[PDB]
Amino acid sequence: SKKPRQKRTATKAYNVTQAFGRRGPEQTQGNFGDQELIRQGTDYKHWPQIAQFAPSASAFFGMSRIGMEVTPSGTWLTYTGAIKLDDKDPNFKDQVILLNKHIDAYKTFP
C-alpha cells in the first residue's frame, strides 16, 4: 500500500508476490519470476542482468504503445512493446537463458 504499484521495488522483505501479486497466466497478471527471484526481488544476485532490459521512464513512454482503458475497476494506462536483445553481445545466449528461466516459471510450482 501507499506507494503506487508501478513505483514499488521488490526486495526480500517485500517480495515480488507481496508487491506485484502472485505470478500466473491471466491477462494483466505478471508471469515473470522463478521461486528465487519471487522471494528476493531486486536482492536477487543476478538482478542486474535482468534490470538491463527494463526501460527508463523516457524509454517506457518513448518506445511503448500506450493506451487508456476505463472499466468498472477504474482507469488503466495500458502499455505494450518489445525490446531487442543485442545479438552482438557475447553474453546474448546467457541473457536469453536468464530471461527464459523466469518467464512462466510459476507453471512448475504451486
Ligand X SMILES: Nc1nc2ccc(OC(F)(F)F)cc2s1
If contact means CB under 5 to 8 A according to the sort of partner, which of ligand X, a second copy, none does residue 65 touch?
Answer: a second copy
Q: Are 46 and 25 in contact (CB under 8 A)?
A: no
Query: CB of residue 45 vs ligand X: minimum separation in angstroms?
Result: 28
**Window 35-54: residues binding a second copy (CB under 8 A):** 41-42, 50-54
Residue 64 binding target from a second copy, ligand X, none, CB below 5 to 8 Å by type: a second copy
Whole-number Å distance between alpha carbons of 38 and 22: 9
Rounded Cα gap, residues 41 and 31, in angstroms = 14
Nearer to ligand X, 28 or 108 (CB): 28
CB-based contact 61:80 (threshold 8 Å): no
Measured from the CB atom, the residue of 68 and 110 that comes closer to a second copy is: 68
User: ∠ CA 60-16-37 to the nearest 5 degrees?
Assistant: 95
Residue 62 — φ and ψ, nearest 5°?
-90, -35
Closer to ligand X at the Cβ: 14 or 83?
83
Site residues for a second copy, 54-93, by CB under 8 A, read 54-69, 73-87, 92
Give the binding site for ligand X (CB under 6 A): 27-28, 69, 71, 76, 78, 82
